[PDB]
Homo-oligomer: A and B are copies of this chain.
């Protein structure tokens, strides 16, 4: 079928993780307002101390139209991605215990000022960029270990 891609917002994303962004978020005035601290945007929840790792994933832009047929999940850790030069990107997510719960399947496009943190065990699509090669500051467990991949009905993202 067709998967409609919608604007990313914290509320629409909240069942799946957290949106990293400043717009309309509560902050603390630090150093007599020299810094505005937009606090507690996401929580890293990783099983092993020694595996709370910062990396950079440099991702090629997808060809469009874009069709998807599987999602991946990381039971052992959250996974945050924050584009490093203001890039818009696209995310697909689903809840579901053993397998993607297809009724929970949603797709979002960011506004270029947003990163995402997927909660542990939440289904999402493998990382890809939008339009241009994009470096994504990553905070996750790293490796290719304890990643479950499950097929989904083939569908085409629609940016109407």
Dominant secondary structure of chain A at its interface with chain B: strand
Residue of B nearest to A40 (CB): B53
- Choose from B45, B56, B126 the contact partner of A31 (Cβ within 8 Å): B126
Specify how many copies of this chain sit in the oligomer: 2
Q: From residue A138, how far is it (CB to closest CB) to chain B in Å?
A: 8
Complex contacts, A21 vs chain B, CB 8 Å: 56
* Chain A window 44-63, contacts with chain B (Cβ cutoff 8 Å), 1 for yes, 0 for no: 11110110111111111000
With A35-B127, A37-B57, A45-B52 given, can you name 10 additional A-B contacts, CB distance below 8 Å?
A36-B57, A37-B58, A38-B56, A39-B53, A41-B53, A42-B53, A44-B52, A44-B139, A52-B52, A139-B139
> What is A's interface to B at a CB cutoff of 8 Å?
20-22, 27, 30-31, 33-47, 49-50, 52-60, 80, 82, 84-86, 115, 117, 126-128, 135, 137, 139, 142-144
